[PDB]
Coordinates of C-alpha atoms and ligand atoms in Angstrom, one line a residue:
Chain G
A1 CA 0.0 0.0 0.0
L2 CA 2.6 2.4 1.0
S3 CA 4.9 1.0 -1.7
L4 CA 2.5 1.7 -4.5
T5 CA 3.2 4.2 -7.2
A6 CA 0.8 7.0 -8.2
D7 CA -0.1 5.3 -11.4
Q8 CA -0.7 2.1 -9.4
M9 CA -2.8 3.9 -6.8
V10 CA -5.0 5.4 -9.5
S11 CA -5.3 1.9 -11.1
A12 CA -6.3 0.3 -7.8
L13 CA -8.9 3.0 -7.1
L14 CA -10.5 2.8 -10.5
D15 CA -10.7 -0.9 -10.3
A16 CA -12.3 -0.7 -6.9
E17 CA -15.2 1.5 -8.1
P18 CA -18.6 0.2 -7.1
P19 CA -21.4 -0.5 -9.6
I20 CA -24.0 2.1 -10.4
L21 CA -27.1 0.7 -9.0
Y22 CA -30.7 1.1 -10.2
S23 CA -33.8 2.0 -8.5
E24 CA -36.2 -0.8 -8.3
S25 CA -42.9 6.6 -2.5
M26 CA -39.9 8.6 -3.5
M27 CA -38.3 8.4 -0.1
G28 CA -38.8 4.7 -0.1
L29 CA -37.1 4.2 -3.4
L30 CA -34.2 6.5 -2.3
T31 CA -33.8 4.6 1.0
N32 CA -33.9 1.2 -0.7
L33 CA -31.2 2.5 -3.1
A34 CA -29.0 3.7 -0.3
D35 CA -29.3 0.4 1.6
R36 CA -28.2 -1.6 -1.4
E37 CA -25.4 0.7 -2.1
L38 CA -23.9 0.3 1.4
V39 CA -23.0 -3.3 0.7
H40 CA -21.0 -2.3 -2.4
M41 CA -19.5 0.6 -0.4
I42 CA -17.9 -1.9 2.0
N43 CA -16.4 -3.9 -0.8
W44 CA -15.0 -0.8 -2.3
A45 CA -13.6 0.3 1.1
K46 CA -11.9 -3.1 1.4
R47 CA -10.2 -2.4 -1.9
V48 CA -8.8 1.0 -1.0
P49 CA -5.1 0.4 -0.4
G50 CA -4.3 0.3 3.3
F51 CA -7.8 0.0 4.5
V52 CA -7.8 -3.7 5.4
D53 CA -4.5 -3.1 7.2
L54 CA -6.6 -1.4 9.9
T55 CA -8.5 -3.1 12.7
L56 CA -12.0 -4.2 12.1
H57 CA -13.1 -1.7 14.8
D58 CA -11.4 1.2 13.1
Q59 CA -12.7 0.1 9.7
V60 CA -16.2 0.3 11.1
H61 CA -15.5 3.6 12.7
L62 CA -14.2 5.2 9.5
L63 CA -17.3 3.9 7.5
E64 CA -19.7 4.9 10.2
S65 CA -18.3 8.3 10.0
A66 CA -18.0 8.6 6.3
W67 CA -20.9 6.7 4.7
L68 CA -23.2 9.7 4.0
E69 CA -20.3 11.8 2.6
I70 CA -19.4 8.9 0.4
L71 CA -23.0 8.5 -0.9
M72 CA -23.0 12.3 -1.5
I73 CA -19.8 12.7 -3.5
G74 CA -20.9 9.8 -5.6
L75 CA -24.3 11.4 -6.2
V76 CA -22.7 14.7 -7.0
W77 CA -20.3 12.9 -9.4
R78 CA -23.0 11.0 -11.2
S79 CA -25.0 14.3 -11.5
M80 CA -22.3 16.4 -12.9
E81 CA -23.5 16.1 -16.4
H82 CA -27.1 16.8 -15.5
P83 CA -27.5 20.4 -14.6
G84 CA -30.2 21.1 -12.1
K85 CA -30.9 17.4 -11.6
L86 CA -29.7 14.7 -9.4
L87 CA -28.9 11.2 -10.8
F88 CA -29.6 9.0 -7.8
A89 CA -29.9 6.3 -10.4
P90 CA -29.9 6.1 -14.2
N91 CA -33.6 5.5 -13.8
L92 CA -34.2 8.0 -11.0
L93 CA -33.2 11.4 -12.1
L94 CA -34.8 14.0 -9.8
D95 CA -35.2 17.7 -9.9
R96 CA -35.6 20.4 -7.3
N97 CA -39.4 20.4 -7.4
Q98 CA -39.4 16.6 -6.8
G99 CA -37.4 17.4 -3.8
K100 CA -40.1 19.6 -2.4
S101 CA -42.4 16.7 -2.2
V102 CA -40.5 15.6 0.8
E103 CA -40.3 17.8 3.9
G104 CA -36.9 19.2 4.6
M105 CA -35.3 17.9 1.4
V106 CA -34.8 20.8 -1.0
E107 CA -32.3 22.5 1.2
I108 CA -30.1 19.4 0.9
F109 CA -31.0 19.1 -2.8
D110 CA -29.9 22.6 -3.5
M111 CA -26.7 22.0 -1.7
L112 CA -26.0 18.8 -3.6
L113 CA -26.8 20.5 -6.9
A114 CA -24.4 23.4 -6.2
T115 CA -21.7 21.0 -5.4
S116 CA -22.4 19.2 -8.7
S117 CA -22.2 22.5 -10.4
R118 CA -18.9 23.3 -8.7
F119 CA -17.5 19.9 -9.9
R120 CA -18.7 20.7 -13.4
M121 CA -17.0 24.1 -13.3
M122 CA -13.8 22.5 -12.3
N123 CA -14.1 19.8 -14.8
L124 CA -13.4 17.2 -12.2
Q125 CA -11.8 14.1 -13.7
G126 CA -12.7 10.5 -12.8
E127 CA -9.2 9.8 -11.6
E128 CA -9.5 12.9 -9.3
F129 CA -12.9 11.8 -8.0
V130 CA -11.8 8.4 -6.8
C131 CA -8.9 9.9 -4.9
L132 CA -11.2 12.3 -3.2
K133 CA -13.7 9.6 -2.3
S134 CA -10.9 7.6 -0.7
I135 CA -9.6 10.6 1.2
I136 CA -13.1 11.0 2.6
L137 CA -13.1 7.4 3.8
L138 CA -9.8 7.6 5.6
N139 CA -10.1 11.2 6.9
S140 CA -13.6 11.8 8.1
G141 CA -13.4 9.6 11.2
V142 CA -9.7 9.9 12.0
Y143 CA -10.0 12.7 14.6
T144 CA -12.8 10.9 16.5
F145 CA -11.1 7.6 17.4
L146 CA -11.8 7.9 21.2
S147 CA -8.7 6.0 22.2
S148 CA -5.1 6.7 23.0
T149 CA -3.7 3.2 22.9
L150 CA -0.4 2.5 21.3
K151 CA -2.4 0.4 18.7
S152 CA -4.6 3.4 18.0
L153 CA -1.6 5.6 17.5
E154 CA -0.2 3.1 15.0
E155 CA -3.5 3.0 13.1
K156 CA -3.6 6.8 12.8
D157 CA -0.1 7.0 11.6
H158 CA -0.9 4.4 8.9
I159 CA -4.0 6.3 7.9
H160 CA -2.0 9.5 7.4
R161 CA 0.7 7.8 5.4
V162 CA -1.9 6.4 3.1
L163 CA -3.6 9.8 2.9
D164 CA -0.2 11.3 2.0
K165 CA 0.2 8.7 -0.8
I166 CA -3.2 9.8 -2.1
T167 CA -2.1 13.4 -2.1
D168 CA 1.0 12.4 -4.0
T169 CA -1.3 10.7 -6.5
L170 CA -3.6 13.8 -6.9
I171 CA -0.5 16.0 -7.6
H172 CA 0.8 13.4 -10.0
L173 CA -2.5 13.4 -11.9
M174 CA -2.4 17.2 -12.2
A175 CA 1.2 17.3 -13.2
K176 CA 0.5 14.7 -16.0
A177 CA -2.3 16.8 -17.3
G178 CA 0.2 19.6 -17.8
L179 CA -0.6 21.8 -14.8
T180 CA 2.1 24.0 -13.5
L181 CA 3.3 23.6 -10.1
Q182 CA 1.4 26.6 -8.7
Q183 CA -1.8 25.4 -10.6
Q184 CA -1.3 21.9 -9.0
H185 CA -1.2 23.3 -5.4
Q186 CA -4.1 25.6 -6.1
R187 CA -6.2 22.8 -7.6
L188 CA -5.3 20.4 -4.8
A189 CA -6.5 23.0 -2.3
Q190 CA -9.7 23.8 -4.2
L191 CA -10.7 20.1 -4.2
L192 CA -9.8 19.5 -0.6
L193 CA -11.8 22.6 0.5
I194 CA -14.9 21.1 -1.3
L195 CA -14.6 18.2 1.1
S196 CA -15.4 20.6 3.9
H197 CA -18.7 21.5 2.1
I198 CA -19.4 17.8 1.6
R199 CA -18.9 17.2 5.3
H200 CA -21.3 20.1 6.0
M201 CA -23.9 18.6 3.6
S202 CA -23.5 15.3 5.4
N203 CA -24.3 16.8 8.8
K204 CA -27.3 18.6 7.4
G205 CA -28.3 15.3 5.8
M206 CA -28.0 13.3 8.9
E207 CA -30.3 15.8 10.7
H208 CA -32.7 15.5 7.9
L209 CA -32.6 11.7 7.9
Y210 CA -33.1 11.7 11.6
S211 CA -36.2 14.0 11.4
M212 CA -37.8 11.1 9.5
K213 CA -36.3 8.2 11.4
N214 CA -37.0 0.7 13.9
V215 CA -33.4 0.1 13.0
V216 CA -30.4 -2.1 13.8
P217 CA -27.5 0.0 15.0
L218 CA -25.3 0.9 12.1
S219 CA -22.1 -0.3 13.7
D220 CA -23.3 -3.9 13.9
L221 CA -24.4 -3.9 10.3
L222 CA -21.1 -2.5 9.2
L223 CA -19.2 -5.2 11.2
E224 CA -21.3 -7.9 9.6
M225 CA -20.4 -6.8 6.2
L226 CA -16.9 -6.0 7.0
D227 CA -16.2 -8.9 9.3
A228 CA -16.4 -11.6 6.8
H229 CA -15.0 -15.1 7.2
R230 CA -12.2 -16.5 5.0
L231 CA -14.1 -19.3 3.6
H232 CA -15.0 -17.5 0.3
Chain V
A1 CA -4.9 43.7 -3.4
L2 CA -3.9 40.3 -4.8
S3 CA -0.7 42.2 -5.4
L4 CA 0.8 41.4 -2.0
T5 CA 3.8 39.1 -1.7
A6 CA 3.6 36.0 0.4
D7 CA 5.7 37.7 3.1
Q8 CA 3.4 40.7 3.0
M9 CA 0.3 38.5 3.4
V10 CA 1.7 36.7 6.3
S11 CA 2.6 40.1 7.9
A12 CA -0.8 41.5 7.3
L13 CA -2.4 38.4 8.8
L14 CA -0.2 38.3 11.9
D15 CA -0.9 42.0 12.6
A16 CA -4.6 41.5 12.2
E17 CA -4.7 39.0 15.0
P18 CA -7.4 39.6 17.6
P19 CA -6.6 39.9 21.3
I20 CA -7.1 37.3 23.9
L21 CA -10.2 38.2 25.9
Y22 CA -11.0 37.3 29.5
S23 CA -14.0 36.1 31.4
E24 CA -15.3 38.1 34.5
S25 CA -23.0 29.7 35.4
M26 CA -20.6 28.1 32.9
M27 CA -22.8 28.5 29.9
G28 CA -23.5 32.2 30.7
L29 CA -19.8 33.0 31.0
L30 CA -19.0 31.2 27.8
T31 CA -21.8 32.9 25.9
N32 CA -20.8 36.3 27.2
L33 CA -17.2 35.6 26.1
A34 CA -18.1 34.4 22.6
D35 CA -20.3 37.4 22.2
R36 CA -17.4 39.7 22.9
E37 CA -15.0 37.8 20.7
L38 CA -17.4 38.3 17.8
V39 CA -16.8 42.1 17.5
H40 CA -13.1 41.5 17.4
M41 CA -13.5 38.8 14.9
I42 CA -15.3 41.3 12.6
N43 CA -12.4 43.7 12.9
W44 CA -10.0 40.9 12.2
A45 CA -11.9 40.0 9.1
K46 CA -11.8 43.5 7.8
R47 CA -8.1 43.3 7.7
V48 CA -7.9 40.0 5.9
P49 CA -6.6 41.0 2.4
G50 CA -9.4 40.9 -0.1
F51 CA -12.3 40.8 2.4
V52 CA -13.4 44.4 2.1
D53 CA -13.5 44.1 -1.7
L54 CA -16.5 42.0 -1.3
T55 CA -20.0 43.4 -1.0
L56 CA -21.3 43.8 2.5
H57 CA -23.9 41.3 1.7
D58 CA -21.1 38.8 1.0
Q59 CA -18.9 39.9 3.9
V60 CA -21.9 39.3 6.2
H61 CA -22.6 36.0 4.6
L62 CA -19.1 34.7 5.1
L63 CA -19.1 35.8 8.7
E64 CA -22.5 34.4 9.5
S65 CA -21.3 31.0 8.1
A66 CA -17.8 31.0 9.5
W67 CA -18.0 32.6 13.0
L68 CA -18.1 29.3 15.1
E69 CA -15.4 27.7 13.1
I70 CA -13.2 30.7 13.7
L71 CA -13.9 30.7 17.4
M72 CA -13.0 27.0 17.4
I73 CA -9.7 27.1 15.6
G74 CA -8.6 30.0 17.9
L75 CA -9.7 28.0 20.9
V76 CA -7.8 24.9 19.7
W77 CA -4.8 27.1 18.9
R78 CA -4.5 28.6 22.4
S79 CA -5.3 25.2 24.0
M80 CA -2.3 23.4 22.5
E81 CA -0.1 23.7 25.6
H82 CA -2.9 22.7 27.9
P83 CA -3.1 18.9 27.4
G84 CA -6.5 17.7 28.4
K85 CA -7.9 21.2 28.7
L86 CA -9.5 24.0 26.7
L87 CA -8.4 27.6 27.4
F88 CA -11.6 29.5 26.6
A89 CA -9.8 32.3 28.4
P90 CA -6.8 32.6 30.7
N91 CA -9.2 32.6 33.5
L92 CA -11.6 30.1 32.1
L93 CA -9.5 27.0 31.7
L94 CA -11.8 23.9 31.6
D95 CA -11.3 20.2 31.5
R96 CA -13.6 17.6 30.0
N97 CA -15.2 16.9 33.4
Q98 CA -16.2 20.5 33.5
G99 CA -17.7 20.1 30.0
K100 CA -19.7 17.0 31.0
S101 CA -21.5 19.4 33.3
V102 CA -23.5 20.8 30.4
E103 CA -25.7 18.4 28.6
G104 CA -24.4 17.8 25.1
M105 CA -21.0 19.5 25.4
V106 CA -18.5 16.8 26.3
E107 CA -18.7 15.2 22.8
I108 CA -17.7 18.6 21.2
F109 CA -15.2 19.1 23.9
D110 CA -13.5 15.8 23.1
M111 CA -13.4 16.8 19.5
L112 CA -11.8 20.1 20.2
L113 CA -9.2 18.3 22.3
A114 CA -8.4 15.9 19.5
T115 CA -8.0 18.9 17.2
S116 CA -5.5 20.4 19.6
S117 CA -3.7 17.1 19.8
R118 CA -3.5 17.0 16.1
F119 CA -2.2 20.6 15.9
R120 CA 0.4 19.6 18.5
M121 CA 1.5 16.5 16.5
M122 CA 1.7 18.6 13.4
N123 CA 3.7 21.3 15.2
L124 CA 1.4 23.9 13.6
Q125 CA 3.1 27.3 13.2
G126 CA 1.6 30.7 13.8
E127 CA 1.9 31.8 10.2
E128 CA 0.1 28.6 9.2
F129 CA -2.6 29.2 11.7
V130 CA -3.4 32.6 10.4
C131 CA -3.6 31.4 6.9
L132 CA -5.9 28.6 7.9
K133 CA -8.2 30.9 9.7
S134 CA -8.3 33.1 6.6
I135 CA -9.2 30.1 4.5
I136 CA -12.0 29.3 6.9
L137 CA -13.5 32.8 6.5
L138 CA -13.4 32.8 2.7
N139 CA -14.4 29.1 2.3
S140 CA -17.1 28.6 4.7
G141 CA -19.9 30.2 2.8
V142 CA -18.8 30.1 -0.9
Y143 CA -21.1 27.1 -1.5
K144 CA -17.2 33.9 -6.2
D145 CA -14.3 34.5 -8.5
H146 CA -12.5 37.1 -6.4
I147 CA -13.0 34.9 -3.4
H148 CA -11.3 32.0 -5.2
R149 CA -8.5 34.3 -6.4
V150 CA -7.8 35.3 -2.8
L151 CA -8.1 31.7 -1.7
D152 CA -5.6 30.7 -4.3
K153 CA -3.3 33.5 -3.0
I154 CA -3.5 32.0 0.5
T155 CA -2.6 28.6 -0.9
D156 CA 0.5 30.1 -2.5
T157 CA 1.3 31.7 0.7
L158 CA 1.1 28.5 2.7
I159 CA 3.3 26.7 0.2
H160 CA 5.7 29.7 0.4
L161 CA 6.0 29.3 4.1
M162 CA 6.6 25.6 3.8
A163 CA 9.2 26.1 1.1
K164 CA 10.9 28.5 3.5
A165 CA 11.0 26.0 6.2
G166 CA 13.0 23.6 4.1
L167 CA 10.4 21.1 3.1
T168 CA 10.7 19.2 -0.1
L169 CA 8.1 19.8 -2.8
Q170 CA 6.5 16.5 -1.7
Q171 CA 6.4 17.4 1.8
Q172 CA 4.9 20.7 0.9
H173 CA 1.8 19.4 -0.9
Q174 CA 1.5 16.6 1.8
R175 CA 1.4 19.2 4.6
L176 CA -0.9 21.5 2.6
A177 CA -3.3 18.6 2.3
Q178 CA -3.0 17.7 6.0
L179 CA -3.9 21.2 7.1
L180 CA -6.8 21.6 4.7
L181 CA -8.3 18.2 5.8
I182 CA -8.2 19.4 9.4
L183 CA -10.7 22.1 8.2
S184 CA -13.2 19.4 7.4
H185 CA -13.0 18.3 11.0
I186 CA -13.5 22.0 12.1
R187 CA -16.5 22.5 9.9
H188 CA -17.8 19.2 11.4
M189 CA -17.3 20.5 14.9
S190 CA -19.0 23.7 14.0
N191 CA -22.0 21.8 12.6
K192 CA -22.3 19.8 15.8
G193 CA -21.8 22.8 18.0
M194 CA -24.5 24.7 16.2
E195 CA -26.8 21.7 16.8
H196 CA -25.8 21.8 20.4
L197 CA -26.3 25.5 20.9
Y198 CA -29.7 25.4 19.3
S199 CA -30.8 22.5 21.4
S200 CA -33.4 27.8 20.3
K201 CA -32.4 30.4 17.7
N202 CA -33.6 34.0 17.5
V203 CA -36.2 35.4 15.1
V204 CA -33.9 38.5 14.5
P205 CA -31.1 37.7 12.0
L206 CA -27.5 37.5 13.0
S207 CA -26.8 39.3 9.7
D208 CA -28.1 42.5 11.1
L209 CA -25.8 42.4 14.1
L210 CA -22.9 41.7 11.9
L211 CA -23.8 44.6 9.5
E212 CA -23.9 46.9 12.4
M213 CA -20.6 45.9 13.8
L214 CA -18.9 46.7 10.5
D215 CA -19.8 50.4 11.1
Ligands
29S1 C1 -27.3 11.9 -0.9 C2 -28.3 10.8 -0.9 C3 -29.5 10.8 -0.3 C4 -30.1 11.8 0.6 C5 -29.6 11.8 1.9 C6 -30.1 12.7 2.8 C7 -31.0 13.6 2.5 O1 -31.4 14.5 3.5 C8 -31.6 13.6 1.3 C9 -31.1 12.7 0.3 N1 -30.1 9.7 -0.6 C10 -31.4 9.3 0.0 C11 -31.1 8.5 1.3 C12 -29.9 8.4 1.8 C13 -29.6 7.7 3.0 C14 -30.6 7.1 3.8 O2 -30.2 6.5 5.0 C15 -31.1 5.8 5.7 C16 -30.3 5.0 6.7 N2 -30.0 3.8 6.5 C17 -29.9 3.3 5.3 C18 -28.8 3.9 4.5 C19 -27.5 3.1 4.6 C20 -26.8 3.3 5.9 C21 -27.6 4.0 7.0 C22 -29.0 3.4 7.3 C23 -31.9 7.2 3.3 C24 -32.1 7.9 2.1 C25 -29.3 8.9 -1.4 C26 -29.5 7.6 -1.9 C27 -28.6 7.0 -2.7 C28 -27.4 7.7 -3.0 O3 -26.4 7.1 -3.8 C29 -27.2 9.0 -2.4 C30 -28.1 9.6 -1.6
29S2 C1 -15.6 26.5 20.8 C2 -16.3 27.4 21.8 C3 -17.5 27.2 22.4 C4 -18.3 25.9 22.4 C5 -19.6 25.9 22.0 C6 -20.4 24.8 22.0 C7 -19.8 23.6 22.3 O1 -20.6 22.4 22.3 C8 -18.5 23.5 22.7 C9 -17.8 24.7 22.7 N1 -17.8 28.2 23.2 C10 -18.9 28.4 24.0 C11 -20.1 29.2 23.2 C12 -19.8 29.5 21.9 C13 -20.8 30.2 21.2 C14 -21.9 30.6 21.7 O2 -22.8 31.3 20.8 C15 -24.0 31.7 21.2 C16 -24.3 33.2 21.0 N2 -23.8 33.7 20.0 C17 -24.5 34.7 19.6 C18 -24.6 34.8 18.1 C19 -23.4 34.4 17.4 C20 -22.1 34.9 17.8 C21 -21.6 34.2 19.1 C22 -22.6 34.1 20.2 C23 -22.2 30.4 23.0 C24 -21.3 29.6 23.8 C25 -16.9 29.2 23.0 C26 -16.7 30.5 23.6 C27 -15.6 31.2 23.2 C28 -14.6 30.7 22.4 O3 -13.5 31.5 22.0 C29 -14.8 29.5 21.8 C30 -15.9 28.7 22.1

């Protein structure tokens, strides 16, 4: 993981991409969709270099922290070519007014759409997207490990080393595309700052999802998926 | 005023730094302190290169969106040397057990402590800190062009500072990334803090208060 090159990081990340799922009232469809995506999210996470090096506990923690962000950046990505609409699924393309049908949703909708617009304006590349998504996975929960064990310190150091490698990969992509050094740093910063907005959206989204909340605790579901046996 | 050098930007940012305020029931004192810090925050913002070029509408918007983040990073910054504690003020140094005293605070408390621990492990520098804080101001409401131009300028300035500390180009973009990802955590803390504080908000807009402070 730490010995991979930039080209090999990109390659692994592209390979790891989950499928685009299809929708099979509107909130039910959306909720079913998210539920199905989660499973594929875990498989993806397990294929992000370094992730399986972590403890199962930490793996759960990172996903528990990042799952909505991860859903969102994927949505924003899929939607980038559909101005004013969100492509939840290839057969579930929703607009703003469709969002009003659900109490509390348009505000999130409008935020998602603006982020999609912002990606469009930057001409975000696929190679860039997967690096960002991976960053989200490894970063979002890293400051909330409520533990100061030696093992935990080791985990966090590993996480930041992998994060460093992904940064190296982003710059590499940008240099390859002919960007000057100054333009590289600037673009790196612009993209990373978008993650702050995605976090923000995620917290607003969690509130919203809670206003409409019975359920198994997410942790145990994540472990079940994550904690697989080795029997194949 | 994109025309400043990196050195000049850093200088302007360091000089713009607000004072450390004092306290004279915990929540009353905290609220009173934050309320007083806000005015100084407004005057700090006015001295951030590029900020006054914005419309007042936009100045107000940035401030309304960024104020708690700004209070937090300052708090974390002055709490670095107080392991296990948060220095809200020189005379208001509180531990997590003191935070547990207010329903819903200890979670945010622990997060602020983790952030201070991260800053400590990163050996965050003053010059870095003032750029970060400037980035928070200009980035927290943007979701435009002049704002991005100034943001780009602050990115250049951070890089400049890291180059001048002797870091390889690889180390530079690695550290730049590390610092900007911390801002995700700060936004997160702000979101959670805002949830906490409202658990209820005024009818009168904060925008009006901010507008009046700029006078
Ligand atoms: C961003 C986004 C949303 C969404 C989320 C929050 C909102 O307030 C509005 C829309 N939705 C709708 C939605 C998202 C998440 C939902 O979570 C319900 C909770 N549970 C099921 C989801 C998996 C893990 C947590 C348990 C329910 C509905 C998406 C569906 C698929 C997708 O790829 C992206 C999204
Ligand atoms: C980080 C931080 C907090 C805080 C708030 C909530 C938490 O759960 C944890 C810490 N507090 C406590 C606190 C922060 C903000 C508060 O805002 C409520 C009133 N606001 C009036 C309208 C907006 C401008 C600021 C005041 C009330 C209390 C701080 C005080 C000073 C300071 O420099 C930093 C902080």
